[PDB]
Design a binder for this molecule. Structure first.
Ligand code: HEM
Ligand code: HEM
Lengths: 137, 137
């Protein structure tokens, strides 16, 4: 279930974080414009770039921290507020996060794995509600 | 994105090149007049002809190099000049290229693979603008 998926992802967090981030960019290619250093780079070139692995891991580590602090996939409002207040997210809207989760859930459903994708969909929906209510436009 | 799509095509070039070229001749059957020996033939018949796979791979080998030497889907002028000046292209106008790109983009949109089809549409239009700049009618 969901708690197991957090363990699965954490176990190989680098690989999962990069995999899922690329899936997000491939499903919604216009989203690459928020990551100016990744424009025009192949996947292999991106994995050669220190900030690519580092920032993506750190993104999914916080994702897992928020997932683990949730109760039945409902995130803390304090965690949603962190995500809204981050300088790196100042020009985001809830639509950016809805896209990420659509891609995340599609990735889980396509994998050789046994993720509880329905719960990740619900967590995404609940986090999007909490972002909007913490003031994300 | 675009850069990764070049690597994806290159990973199974023969198949993608023949798939896309066939999509082009089937959408635009009129275009067979520019070629020798292709009229009167089903897809599987073309695929078994001595020269079909080889020439289509040569076309897409170079198209991938032109895509790869581009910056932000804008091809090099010297690559455009090459294409305009090739003797094999002496009877072409930019409309032939526009039709190829229409078919390429529709093929990507229909495929199971996650191509950045909007980027290929931009690349096709930048390439036709570059052909015109290089003097193709
Ligand atoms: C639950 C979802 C998200 C979490 C937990 C998260 C977390 C993080 C973290 C920890 C950082 C700092 C990383 C460094 O190192 C970061 C930076 C950043 N995030 Fe997010 N983020 C999320 C969603 C998104 C989305 C949906 C977008 C855009 C579509 C986005 C765009 C960015 C950008 C542009 C930066 C700064 C530049 C960079 O690190 O490459 N984030 N985020
Ligand atoms: C970016 C687009 C294109 C590229 C990179 C390209 C490249 C090439 C190359 C590399 C060859 C030589 C193949 C060989 O030596 O075996 C070739 C030949 C040829 N091209 Fe193009 N070409 C392009 C577009 C077109 C289009 C749109 C047409 C007509 C609709 C066309 C018509 C021909 C013809 C008639 C030949 C010689 C006959 C043949 O190979 O069957 N090309 N092209």
């Amino acid at each position: 279930g969901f708690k197991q998926d957090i363990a699965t992802i954490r176990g190989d967090l680098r690989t999962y974080a990069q995999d899922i981030f690329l899936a997000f960019l491939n499903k919604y290619p216009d989203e690459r414009r928020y990551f100016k250093n990744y424009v025009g780079k192949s996947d292999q070139e991106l994995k050669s770039m220190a900030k690519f692995g580092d920032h993506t891991e750190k993104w999914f580590n916080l994702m897992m921290e928020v997932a683990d602090r949730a109760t039945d996939c409902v995130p803390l409002a304090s965690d949603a507020n962190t995500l809204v207040q981050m300088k790196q997210h100042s020009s985001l809207t809830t639509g950016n996060f809805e896209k990420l989760f659509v891609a995340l859930v599609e990735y889980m459903r396509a994998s050789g794995q046994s993720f509880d994708s329905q719960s990740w969909d619900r967590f995404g929906k609940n986090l999007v509600s909490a972002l909007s209510s913490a003031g994300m436009k």
